């Protein structure tokens with residue numbers, strides 16, 4: 001009887017509704033061809049348009065093993081549907097509060113996935129501008145994926161010039177706020193009034209607790225430079241000693257999930273399902289229109305790395 005869930009329910013089986021906040025709620029669901037669990041961000045357009053499409057059109061052109069992958073895309077008459085990677089681990093935010101502060105070791109593993117994500121985003125020419133621990137999840141395998149692109153509670157991680165409206169280096173500051181929140185358990189510049197914080201952010205003076213490594217403070221000092229030209233570049237960030245402390249080899253920000261290389265095993269299987277020549281489907285898949293076929297393929301080689309047999313229904 002669903003009037004708007006026509007197309008969706010033809011390709012997915014609905015499950016437990018999550019995310020309820022009027023503006024958007026995410027319901028997990030099962031891709032029936034692949035039997036693979038997905039999350040679907042449901043938004044009606046009665047409660048904006050461009051900010052969302054700026055996120056979706058970004059996500060259309062970025063693929064990376066630490067960005068929450070976007071599959072099919074669907075727009076109803078008064079609704080919009082986005083299916084994305086399954087991220088049951090939850091926010092890194094709650095993961096922070098789970099165990100008070102985070103060890104330098106544990107903070108190092110989380111953070112290097114973050115830089116590899118953000119360093120790849122910058123290669124393609126985008127900046128996320130809104131980096132908060134509420135915007136990065138854990139997949140089924142404790143890998144980290146970033147969401148809520150949108151811009152391409154959110155002021156504390158904002159760079160000084162981002163409040164000045166005066167360009168990728170705003171994230172290097174945001175990641176510096178992240179790391180401080182990671183190893184400790186609190187923010188560099190927070191307080192109850194927004195007026196006082198603007199002052200503290202432009203002032204750039206923040207405390208430094210007991211437990212922090214002499215290697216950390218250096219890195220944060222290079223990251224929390226109100227001078228964006230004196231802020232540390234992404235190039236030096238990928239080779240930095242704190243980042244190469246134990247885990248000792250360059251941050252592999254190179255996307256291992258490509259727009260260019262189509263896995264044969266998945267495309268051979270996909271062609272027998274549609275009754276096409278394999279060469280015919282390969283070019284068709286490379287369109288990446290983010291309709292059903294793209295969802296089927298990208299959850300098929302995902303099913304492959306999952307270890308499952310590469311089958312449909």
Ligand SMILES: O=C(Nc1ccc2c(c1)CCNCC2)c1ccc(-c2cn[nH]c2)cc1OCc1ccccc1
Nearest residue numbers: 018019026039068084085086087088089090091147148
């Ligand atoms: O599948 C997602 N989340 C998710 C799935 C299962 C469970 C949990 C969470 C909470 C842990 N215990 C219950 C199991 C999931 C995947 C992608 C996106 C997403 C991708 N772009 N934008 C949003 C959002 C998702 O959720 C939203 C969420 C809900 C509660 C907190 C944190 C996050």
